[PDB]
Design a protein around this ligand. Structure first.
Ligand SMILES: Nc1nc2c(ncn2[C@@H]2O[C@H](COP(=O)(O)OP(=O)(O)O)[C@@H](OP(=O)(O)OP(=O)(O)O)[C@H]2O)c(=O)[nH]1
Length: 288
């Protein structure tokens, strides 16, 4: 495992962040041993993206067993960002703080309200946790441009964003600016939908020694703008195979094909417009 500085917060996170997403097929001991495999493989950044009794139980017991200051725990708070109020912090106390048995969260990661401002009730409560030494940072996950006003907020110490193989220099630049303005950037969807099925993406499955989950995670990890790539793991063999990818070097053949293929793709993604004015062909013409 490799570790990167979380932007300016002064704490180190593993290059991978394992996301515990509610899953009806894992009992508490299953979640416990998941988190254990993660720690044993050097992963110290978790994201809790669920509130199931069995998950908080097992994740809480595992987190509980190592020293709290080795761990970076992100709580993923979904729903419309502009509906968050007192109720949300009642939910947060019971799920994040009692449920996992933490005294502080390293980060709370909300949806983008596409808005200069959060709700009054919520923002107040967050500064209350803040002073209570009980929430290190706020974070805003977003697909477009977070509002410069919201980024100005002093609670806001991080963003998360889809960055992957497919991403545009469009998408990329934003993640880079964020990094320069001292925001920590969390990488998401590293293996995309488009590819779950001149250049073309055949090399993704033909590369001797590499899988596509693996090649794709490969690329995500080469972006310095990203403080950590988010991964998600049904199980133990997966966490093992992805923590391995961090120590491997993408073969420079694959890196070149990753870029031809990307051009190729977004070329035909712009043969799909089709503006038909059967004009511009022979006919005297204009008065100038
Ligand atoms: N990175 C990331 N961002 C998230 C996630 N969930 C919500 N967001 C952010 O919140 C904005 C609005 O999301 P919500 O309205 O809460 O729910 P939605 O994600 O289903 O739209 C999103 O813009 P948008 O939804 O892309 O635009 P629009 O077409 O909804 O206007 C996106 O920037 C997530 O899992 N990851």
């Amino acid at each position: 495992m490799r570790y990167r500085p979380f932007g300016s917060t002064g704490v180190a996170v593993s290059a991978l962040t394992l996301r515990l997403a509610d899953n009806p097929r894992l009992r508490a001991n299953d979640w416990r041993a998941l988190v254990f495999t993660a720690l044993e493989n050097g992963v110290n950044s978790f994201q809790i993206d669920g509130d199931a009794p069995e998950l908080l139980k097992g994740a809480g017991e595992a987190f509980a067993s190592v020293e709290r200051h080795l761990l970076f725990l992100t709580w993923r708070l979904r729903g419309d960002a502009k509906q968050l109020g007192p109720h949300t912090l009642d939910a947060l106390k019971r799920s994040a703080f009692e449920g996992l048995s933490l005294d502080y969260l390293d980060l709370l990661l909300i949806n983008d309200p596409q808005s200069a401002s959060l709700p009054m009730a919520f923002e107040s409560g967050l500064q209350d946790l803040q002073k209570g030494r009980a929430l290190r940072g706020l974070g805003v996950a977003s697909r477009g441009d977070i509002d410069p006003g919201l980024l100005a907020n002093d609670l806001v110490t991080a963003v998360s964003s889809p960055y992957n193989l497919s991403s545009g220099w469009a998408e990329r630049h934003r993640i880079r600016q964020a990094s320069q303005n001292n925001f920590a950037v969390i990488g998401e969807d590293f293996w995309p939908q488009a590819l779950r099925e001149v250049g073309g993406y055949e090399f993704l499955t033909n590369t001797p020694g590499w899988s596509a989950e693996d090649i794709c995670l490969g690329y995500a990890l080469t972006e310095p703008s990203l403080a950590t790539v988010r991964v998600t793991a049904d199980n133990r063999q997966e966490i093992e195979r992805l923590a391995a990818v961090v120590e491997r070097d993408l073969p420079t053949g694959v890196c070149a094909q990753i870029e031809m293929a990307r051009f190729s793709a977004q070329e035909r993604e712009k043969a799909a417009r089709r503006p038909k004015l059967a004009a511009a062909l022979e006919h005297h013409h204009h008065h100038h």
